[PDB]
Amino acid sequence: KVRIYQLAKELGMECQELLELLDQMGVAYKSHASTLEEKDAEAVRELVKEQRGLQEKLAEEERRKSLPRRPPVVVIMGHVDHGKTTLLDYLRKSRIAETQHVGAFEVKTPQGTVVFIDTPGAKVADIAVIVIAADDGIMPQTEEAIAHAKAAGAKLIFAINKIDLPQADPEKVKRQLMERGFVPEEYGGDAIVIPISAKTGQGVQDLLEMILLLAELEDYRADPNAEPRGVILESKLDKQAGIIANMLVQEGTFRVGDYVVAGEAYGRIRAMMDADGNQRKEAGPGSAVQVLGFQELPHPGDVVEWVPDLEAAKEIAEERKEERKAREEEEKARRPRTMAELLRAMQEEGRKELNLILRADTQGSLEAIQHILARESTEDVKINILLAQVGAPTESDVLLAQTANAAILAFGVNPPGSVKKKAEEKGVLLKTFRIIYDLVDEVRNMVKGQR
Ligand SMILES: Nc1nc2c(ncn2[C@@H]2O[C@H](COP(=O)(O)OP(=O)(O)O)[C@@H](O)[C@H]2O)c(=O)[nH]1
């Protein structure tokens, strides 16, 4: 027994909504007063609740999208002397006066502020700026950077340096990328090519505007409250201080007095210093800070977690550890057995036939999946890249695998309607990956012969 209006008062509904529901549920009412059976009592109560939760799912989409934007982190890669140390020096400069490092530094532009790494892994950089000297083109250190970088999922700009000089061939470079598959935006393609100098700092400016654009185009936004998290930039034994650990802040705000955990290493932030020279008791996301008070040396690209108490710190840091020691003995034996199978396991033939195919967003990035893969048939098995091409997949390919038994792997395109469909019904190892690595680590599974 209930009065439609009592129900909407109880639930926290008001009736306009309550009758509206019932007048989709399909249950008679003369007016808001008219009575209901409890079966009714809850027929809404249950059919009211699902929506009510369901809306609080959008709210979180409410917490999610409206979140403040956060400083873009650029890191820089390139060949030993193609202008990296030099262009960084240019970027640090501004507070002329306006210094021990924290692993990163800032440039504050009217358009935005950008973090640029100052280091010698967690995914620490939304972006990479391949430095290619205009003169000596693409030399091995340069390919390695792009490949590795493109596994990061890091967004890449190619910066050309040493152009003030009278012998740079900027085409030579643009071409060199082309043949590779990173084809300039200028040609009609998808790579970003910015002619720069590092001594008069021509191009620096834009490389500033460009990156910001890239930051506008993907709202890189971080919510200060969220459980605080970061990653480990650097770690040292400070001669006077003790254990000192450069961190960059990912989401969350870290406050001195916070308990923290970073792989096997734990502590209580006792202090935090920001590159300026001033102590902070808050670190917001995109904040490179020098943290003091840790009980070990942490390793770089370990995620910094916040913990409420220093006992949870110990538990996680030792939950992590006794798996690693657990590994170790594992090789502490594997290695005693196959380490010496043939010495260099050579007389041993080599033949294992691992076959796969690669379809991609771009060649600019298909020829990075391999570069990485190619270092990596270091096990008894040697893995075959059967056909490589760009794009979404083939049923034949689903058929191809059979002749093949090669597994089909993809990055930057998702499968199609029945290719997943024949893909699956068909006995074929199909994959879709977010990031090229998470394409790659998987490849490691495939050493164990897929059984
Ligand atoms: N001509 C010219 N040379 C440059 C410029 N910027 C840097 N270089 C040169 O690049 C070389 C390598 O710089 P360095 O920072 O030591 O190496 P990297 O950081 O590994 O690229 C230096 O010997 C400089 O002469 C530039 O704008 N023009």
Annotation: binding site for GTP: 78-85, 118-120, 161-164
Instruction: End-to-end CA distance of the chain: give it in Å, rounded.
Output: 64
Annotation: binding site: 78-85, 118-120, 161-164
Resolution of this model in Å is 2.8
Q: Which two tokens stand for residue 317?
A: 């840091």
Torsion of CA 142, 147, 153, 154, to 10 degrees: 0
Residue list, ligand 1 pocket, CB within 6 Å: 78, 80-86, 161-162, 164-165, 197-199
Q: How far is the CA of 87 from the centre of ligand 1 (A)?
A: 8
User: How many alpha carbons fall within 13 Å on the CB side of residue 127?
Assistant: 26
Q: Which two tokens stand for residue 308?
A: 């409420």
Q: How far is the CA of 205 from the centre of ligand 1 (A)?
A: 18
| C-beta separation of 134 from 161 below 8 A | yes
Nearest Cα residue to 170 out of 159, 183, 181:
159
Which of 80, 82, 85, 86, when mutated, tests ligand 1's pocket best, judged by the most ligand atoms within 8 Å of its CB?
86
Q: How far is the CA of 94 from the centre of ligand 1 (A)?
A: 20
Q: What is the 3 state secondary structure string of the chain?
A: CEEHHHHHHHHCCCHHHHHHHHHHHCCCCCCCCCEECCHHHHHHHHHHHHHHHHHHHHHHHHHHHCCCECCCEEEEEECCCCCHHHHHHHHHCCCCCCCCCCCEEEEECCCCEEEEECCCCCCCCCEEEEEEECCCCCCHHHHHHHHHHHHHCCEEEEEEECCCCCCCCHHHHHHHHHHHCCCECCCCCCEEEEECCCCCCCCHHHHHHHHHHHHHHCCCECCCCCCCEEEECCCEEECCCEEEEEEEEEECCECCCCEEEECCEEEECCEEEECCCEECCCECCCEEEEEECCCCCCCCCCCEEEECCHHHHHHHHHHHHHHHHHHHHHHHHHHHHHCCCCCCCCCCCCCCEEEEEEEECCCCCCCCHHHHHHCCCCCCCEEEEEEEEECCCCHHHHHHHHHHCCEEEEECCCCCCCCCHHHHHCCCCEEEECCCHHHHHHHHHCCCCCC
Q: How far is the CA of 86 from the centre of ligand 1 (A)?
A: 6
Dihedral sign for Cα atoms in the order 422, 428, 432, 436? negative
Q: Whose CA is nearest to atom 12 of ligand 1?
A: 81
Whole-angstrom distance, CA of residue 114 vs CA of residue 441: 30
Q: Whose CA is nearest to atom 15 of ligand 1?
A: 85
**Minimum-distance ligand 1 atom for the alpha carbon of 201:** 27
Q: How far is the CA of 160 from the centre of ligand 1 (A)?
A: 11
**Minimum-distance ligand 1 atom for the alpha carbon of 196:** 27
Whole-angstrom distance, CA of residue 91 vs CA of residue 78: 16
| C-beta separation of 133 from 172 below 8 A | no
Q: Which two tokens stand for residue 3?
A: 């009065």
71 contact partners, CB below 8 Å, separation of at least 6: 106, 112, 113, 114, 115, 285, 286
Q: Name the residue type at position 67.
A: L
Residue 31, number of CB atoms within 10 A of its CB: 9
**Minimum-distance ligand 1 atom for the alpha carbon of 165:** 1
The experimental method behind these coordinates is: X-ray
CA angle 408, 411, 414 (to 5 degrees): 80
Which of 79, 81, 90, 117, when mutated, tests ligand 1's pocket best, judged by the most ligand atoms within 8 Å of its CB?
81
Full set of structural domains in the chain with CATH: 1-66 (1.10.10.2480), 67-221 (3.40.50.300), 222-308 (no CATH), 309-344 (6.10.250.2720), 345-451 (3.40.50.10050)
Q: Whose CA is nearest to atom 22 of ligand 1?
A: 81
| C-beta separation of 256 from 281 below 8 A | yes
**Minimum-distance ligand 1 atom for the alpha carbon of 82:** 21
CA angle 190, 116, 120 (to 5 degrees): 105
Q: Which two tokens stand for residue 239?
A: 């001669």
Whole-angstrom distance, CA of residue 295 vs CA of residue 9: 56
- Paired strand residues for 231: 248
**Minimum-distance ligand 1 atom for the alpha carbon of 86:** 15
248 contact partners, CB below 8 Å, separation of at least 6: 73, 103, 104, 115, 117, 124, 230, 231, 233, 286, 287, 288, 289
**Minimum-distance ligand 1 atom for the alpha carbon of 80:** 20
Q: How far is the CA of 351 from the centre of ligand 1 (A)?
A: 46
